[PDB]
Structure 1
Amino acid sequence: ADGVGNASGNWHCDSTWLGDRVITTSTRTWALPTYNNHLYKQISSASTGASNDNHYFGYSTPWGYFDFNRFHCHFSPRDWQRLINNNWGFRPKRLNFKLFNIQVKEVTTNDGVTTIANNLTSTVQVFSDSEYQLPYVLGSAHQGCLPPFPADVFMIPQYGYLTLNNGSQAVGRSSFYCLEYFPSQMLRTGNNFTFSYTFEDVPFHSSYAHSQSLDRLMNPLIDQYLYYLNRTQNQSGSAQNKDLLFSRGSPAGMSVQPKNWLPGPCYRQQRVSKTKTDNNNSNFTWTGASKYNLNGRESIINPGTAMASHKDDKDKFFPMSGVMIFGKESAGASNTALDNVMITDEEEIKATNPVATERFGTVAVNLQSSSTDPATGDVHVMGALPGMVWQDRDVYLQGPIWAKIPHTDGHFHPSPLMGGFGLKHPPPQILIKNTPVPANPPAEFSATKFASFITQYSTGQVSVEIEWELQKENSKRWNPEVQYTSNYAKSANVDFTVDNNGLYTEPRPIGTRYLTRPL
């Protein structure tokens, strides 16, 4: 239960702050079509003339899925502000899902005149793959998430997946999943669906920027008790003579003092400028791109290793594929102008992580001697070395929240490369589909496959509640900190607001790293 003329759920949609806790609960109203005419279909790069690196094999499903894996699905711009401006970190604790006031309509089109009526007896099916038995497509930054603006109605994305492929063909080990082979709950107007999940223990997300840097971590007023080789050729003597002179760590030469740690790992990336003139005249997008080679296919590393987007005084350049880029509502599908996208800046970590477009360092390459000169080389790729420390890619008000850690034998610091929390057991995929309704069948039994169905779609609200744990700050810093603030200068439109046509717009990407914390 209960009934047809009885709401099966209310509009819960608030935000509650409780010291070290904050419950965000937002509800949006959705629309679900009938996909593929209730058919599972094999799909492939086959006959697309697709590049060799773009081949793929998989299946498109008749099911739709719920996806709220974006911060703006839960935090209003103002809340996000509250969060990033006063806390050193946060993480998800537990969540709550709910489907209600579901209504199934049946459209009868004819003579251009289409009519929409209720089919009070139709059902919609749901089920959460809580045992992760289906391929996981959440956490690949796809569209179809809950809209940022509560007053927006959205369309549920269609669920499709991929599997092992050799060119545009499949292989023996390829897998095909049928979602109807999963116990799922059926609903009619008066029914509703609910379910709760608990997040696994996960590190707080570092919502702060360091107020010191690895190199500058010593006492500016005092020497060290350590010495380093300072000269191998004596100064003057009106001749250049071989020697071995040592000096001891001085504040006057911090760049040469023995230290305890190393910058973060790094996989260098090409650098491009926001002013076309500076760029080389060619299309190096794929040519000079940092790609990884997985079984014959190349794939751009994007955004790849967390690295400072640019060195100080140069928010002019950016890693060719080392920064998150969101599109403004104006941006088109492909080859859209620069001012139609928003490129994130990850320079807040230049204090501990290597800059993405530069060399990580220099390495000795030979054995110097009186007869052969000491040579070196530039290291462009650097794996994990003991003593390394680093910061992970920051998250954004419109970025991903989590991603499922692949189920592999081993894995290194599994933090989703494009921002987020790495979960061994993430929130499960919620699958929904309209059950088929056979149109009038022949008056004489026919065994051939049924392919005539009442055309219909469904609609209802969905509520998602998440309890977040805050990590308050207690900086003993004396001077004011940086804080996200809307510009007070007058203008035609207000940031994160609708316009004269009712189109909600997210002007810029907001990070979370404003508050300071020493190393």
Structure 2
Amino acid sequence: ADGVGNASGNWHCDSTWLGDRVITTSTRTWALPTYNNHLYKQISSASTGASNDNHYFGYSTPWGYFDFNRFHCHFSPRDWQRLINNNWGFRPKRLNFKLFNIQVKEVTTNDGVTTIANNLTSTVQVFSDSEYQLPYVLGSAHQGCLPPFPADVFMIPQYGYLTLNNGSQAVGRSSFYCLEYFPSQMLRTGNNFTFSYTFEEVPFHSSYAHSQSLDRLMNPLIDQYLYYLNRTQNQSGSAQNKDLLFSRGSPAGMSVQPKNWLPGPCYRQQRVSKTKTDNNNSNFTWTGASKYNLNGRESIINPGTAMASHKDDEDKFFPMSGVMIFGKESAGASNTALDNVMITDEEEIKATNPVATERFGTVAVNFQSSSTDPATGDVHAMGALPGMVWQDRDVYLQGPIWAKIPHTDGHFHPSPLMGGFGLKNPPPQILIKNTPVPANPPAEFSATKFASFITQYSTGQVSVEIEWELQKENSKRWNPEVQYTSNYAKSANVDFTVDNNGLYTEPRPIGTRYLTRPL
């Protein structure tokens, strides 16, 4: 508790590298409006003309929420470079969150003159949902996270959620949540808020590419002792006669050579070229999409199973729904051109992972015999097989960090498909609201609910501190690695900087996979 004239916190944006730990700290200044005029609202797809696939039922809330779940909320571009060039992995360890220097301001409008003044006795309400009792809205990759650039002031997003829906209607099993029915701390201008959080144990994200591929793991100099069936008919000179001929795995035959392992799972997606003229002329984004069917309602699979974006020298192709796509600062919200988006490239994992736009392989579909020819078929979707190995999708400086693992009877490899760390108990949602301040009530009692309030909003600073654990690179590789680097040549701007108007931009996505490891 502080008075009116004492600051309740200090600005801390820093990055500290010690041993196998790096600690990031970021401070931003925020602004919180009143949402929904202090009301909870039933929201629905009703009377929107929505397709069956787009129906929803839910509620909008008066509350806002803090979202720091993206990597540029924490690492600067230089810091991200230090991470990805020097480290085979990393994971989050613990978390510290602070709200301070609260200012609540009332807004008065007379004629066209808006006047803003301090309201020193008003409060804001803050609580974290530590027991995960609310619908968890983080991890859907929503905008409204802390800005990448520390000098930018950001608006706090409005909290809302969805429940079970049949069309645009609800079901008796649908849940409604009042956030005023949790406890929350109330803060005047001298108060501050804090809590800490510990990440559970998670695997290090793999920041590296394999320097080998699954099908190349053999000694190139040595034969095997295993035999395979090489030929079902002998050549002779006269005519082809049925025969059974066997060869042992040799270096000339690496493709037919027996192996211990299989590539990872595959769900095939449509291939689309970054050159317009190569693609079919039609709108196939929905009709040609890889989709799943849930309760008679289709949803595009995206980004889907972790798969290589393209094979060698096909770089102009990308999976239609299968890659993370970031917008530039010049991108519009809908139907923006290719030059305004940044399409990530998952190419590093083609060592262990199927290419996203190709079949997993071929299977025998029949019994051959002297009468009937052997037939095969393509496998476009392949589930887990014993012996499969795969890499998870890479993360990105502007991509998400964690997702909440759904609470369910069963999981298979619960790594979030957009990338990052799947968490049973993720960092909790932090909810904030301006406390309603009634206007002058009438002189005689009325039992009707107050609709009349003093217009106000709030602003302050927020700090997030995350400790990260690093996995060091042990390699015996003789030759130099690939590194992320900035271009040394001259240019009009510097990457990851403001322009002459003050606009901070991010030139490109930066993944984590540069250093290499044997497979």
Q: TM-score range by the shorter chain?
A: over 0.9
CA distance in 2, matches of 1:198, 1:110: 50
CA distance in 2, matches of 1:263, 1:492: 45
Q: CA deviation at 1:7?
A: 0.1
SS of residue paired to 1:285: coil
Q: What do residues 9-38 of structure 1 show as CA deviations (whole Å, max 9, x unaligned)? A: 000110000010000011100000000000
CA distance in 1, matches of 2:110, 2:264: 64
Q: What do residues 68-115 of structure 1 show as CA deviations (whole Å, max 9, x unaligned)? A: 000000000000000000000000000000000000000101211100
Match of 1:151 in 2: 151
CA distance in 2, matches of 1:227, 1:168: 62
Q: CA deviation at 1:311?
A: 0.3
SS of residue paired to 2:358: coil
Match of 1:74 in 2: 74
CA distance in 1, matches of 2:332, 2:317: 23
SS of residue paired to 1:509: coil
SS of residue paired to 1:104: strand
Structure 1 range deviating more: 234-243 or 498-507:
234-243
SS of residue paired to 1:196: strand
Q: CA deviation at 1:216?
A: 0.4
SS of residue paired to 2:466: strand
SS of residue paired to 2:285: helix
Q: What do residues 98-136 of structure 1 show as CA deviations (whole Å, max 9, x unaligned)? A: 000000000101211100000000000000000000000
Match of 1:487 in 2: 487
Q: What do residues 454-485 of structure 1 show as CA deviations (whole Å, max 9, x unaligned)? A: 00000000000000000010100000000000
CA distance in 1, matches of 2:112, 2:476: 70
- Listed as ranges, the matches of 1:44-443 within 5 Å are 44-443=44-443
Gaps of 5+ in 2: none
Match of 1:28 in 2: 28
CA distance in 2, matches of 1:51, 1:333: 20
Q: CA deviation at 1:315?
A: 1.1
CA distance in 2, matches of 1:95, 1:276: 46
Q: CA deviation at 1:254?
A: 0.2
Q: What do residues 399-432 of structure 1 show as CA deviations (whole Å, max 9, x unaligned)? A: 0000000000000000000001000000000000
Q: CA deviation at 1:2?
A: 1.4
Q: What do residues 378-408 of structure 1 show as CA deviations (whole Å, max 9, x unaligned)? A: 0000000000000000000000000000000
Q: CA deviation at 1:515?
A: 0.4
Q: CA deviation at 1:236?
A: 2.4
Q: What do residues 201-230 of structure 1 show as CA deviations (whole Å, max 9, x unaligned)? A: 000000000000000000000000000000
Q: What do residues 341-399 of structure 1 show as CA deviations (whole Å, max 9, x unaligned)? A: 00000000000000000000000000000011100000000000000000000000000
CA distance in 2, matches of 1:24, 1:275: 40
CA distance in 2, matches of 1:102, 1:122: 10
SS of residue paired to 1:197: strand
CA distance in 1, matches of 2:238, 2:464: 79
Q: CA deviation at 1:449?
A: 1.1
SS of residue paired to 1:513: coil
CA distance in 2, matches of 1:443, 1:233: 104
CA distance in 1, matches of 2:167, 2:485: 50
CA distance in 2, matches of 1:305, 1:428: 27
SS of residue paired to 2:120: coil
Indicate whether 1:457 and 2:462 are aligned: no
Q: CA deviation at 1:235?
A: 1.5
Q: What do residues 221-249 of structure 1 show as CA deviations (whole Å, max 9, x unaligned)? A: 00000000000000123110000000000
Match of 1:5 in 2: 5
SS of residue paired to 1:169: coil
SS of residue paired to 1:349: helix
CA distance in 1, matches of 2:127, 2:205: 30
SS of residue paired to 1:284: coil
Q: Identity of counterpart residues, as a percentage?
A: 99
Q: CA deviation at 1:48?
A: 0.3
CA distance in 1, matches of 2:267, 2:340: 28
Q: CA deviation at 1:200?
A: 0.1
SS of residue paired to 1:482: coil
CA distance in 2, matches of 1:315, 1:157: 37
CA distance in 1, matches of 2:111, 2:333: 34
SS of residue paired to 1:410: coil
CA distance in 1, matches of 2:185, 2:29: 20
SS of residue paired to 1:79: helix
Q: CA deviation at 1:512?
A: 0.2
CA distance in 1, matches of 2:89, 2:192: 35
Q: What do residues 29-83 of structure 1 show as CA deviations (whole Å, max 9, x unaligned)? A: 0000000000000000000001110000000000000000000000000000000
SS of residue paired to 1:84: helix
Q: Give the TM-score taking structure 1 as reference length.
A: 1.00
CA distance in 2, matches of 1:81, 1:288: 38
CA distance in 1, matches of 2:324, 2:236: 53
CA distance in 2, matches of 1:181, 1:343: 43
CA distance in 1, matches of 2:481, 2:489: 21
CA distance in 1, matches of 2:514, 2:346: 12
CA distance in 2, matches of 1:188, 1:314: 59
CA distance in 1, matches of 2:56, 2:98: 35
Q: What do residues 421-447 of structure 1 show as CA deviations (whole Å, max 9, x unaligned)? A: 000000000000000000000010000
Q: Give the TM-score taking structure 2 as reference length.
A: 1.00
Q: CA deviation at 1:489?
A: 1.1
CA distance in 1, matches of 2:399, 2:255: 37
Match of 1:37 in 2: 37
CA distance in 1, matches of 2:197, 2:15: 19
Structure 1 range deviating more: 233-242 or 319-328:
233-242
CA distance in 1, matches of 2:146, 2:289: 33
SS of residue paired to 2:59: strand
CA RMSD between the two structures: 0.4
